[PDB]
Design a protein around this motif. Structure first.
Motif, short mmCIF file in Angstrom:
data_model
loop_
_atom_site.label_atom_id
_atom_site.label_comp_id
_atom_site.label_asym_id
_atom_site.label_seq_id
_atom_site.Cartn_x
_atom_site.Cartn_y
_atom_site.Cartn_z
N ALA A 1 0.79 -1.39 0.06
CA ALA A 1 0.15 -0.05 0.19
C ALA A 1 0.81 1.15 -0.01
N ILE A 2 1.82 1.27 0.82
CA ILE A 2 2.85 2.47 0.79
C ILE A 2 3.51 2.69 -0.56
N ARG A 3 3.93 1.51 -1.27
CA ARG A 3 4.57 1.57 -2.55
C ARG A 3 3.35 1.98 -3.46
N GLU A 4 2.20 1.80 -3.18
CA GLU A 4 1.10 2.23 -4.30
C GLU A 4 0.78 3.51 -4.05
N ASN A 5 0.30 4.08 -3.15
CA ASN A 5 -0.25 5.57 -2.84
C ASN A 5 0.74 6.31 -1.94
N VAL A 7 1.71 9.36 -1.57
CA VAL A 7 1.52 11.15 -1.33
C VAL A 7 0.85 11.27 0.07
N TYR A 8 0.97 12.38 0.54
CA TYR A 8 0.68 12.65 1.81
C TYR A 8 -0.52 14.03 1.50
#
Length: 48
Positions: A1-5, A7-8
RNA sequence: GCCGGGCCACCCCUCCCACGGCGCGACCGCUGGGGCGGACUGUCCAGUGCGCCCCGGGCGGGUCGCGCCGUCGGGCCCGGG
């Protein structure tokens, strides 16, 4: 999930009712008259 | 000495600008009261700032406008008779 999205998205800014939680600094005349009251009270007690 | 012009001197009116004085008005900050919300202080119920509004007054300077006064004033000593 982190690798997917990664952005902050910032939290939206909120309205403020402007309520002070601390104590504002005391003023010059305020502390001078505080000292004057303390002297008057001490002298009154000494006379009494 | 030979004919004309202009200017300043007479006497009167009127423009502008500069300087100094006096009075009026408009905008400013500083300072005494009242109303409001609250925050604080004092080993009597008394007092102290704060933010807003009302402010009735004072202060002078900075700018602007107005009227008067003075200049052997400046405008080829403006211009008019």
């Amino acid at each position: 999930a982190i690798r997917e999205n990664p952005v902050y998205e910032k939290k939206p800014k909120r309205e403020v009712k402007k309520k002070r939680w601390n104590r504002p600094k005391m003023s010059l005349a305020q502390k001078k008259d505080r000292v004057a009251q303390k002297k008057a009270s001490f002298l009154r007690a000494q006379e009494r």
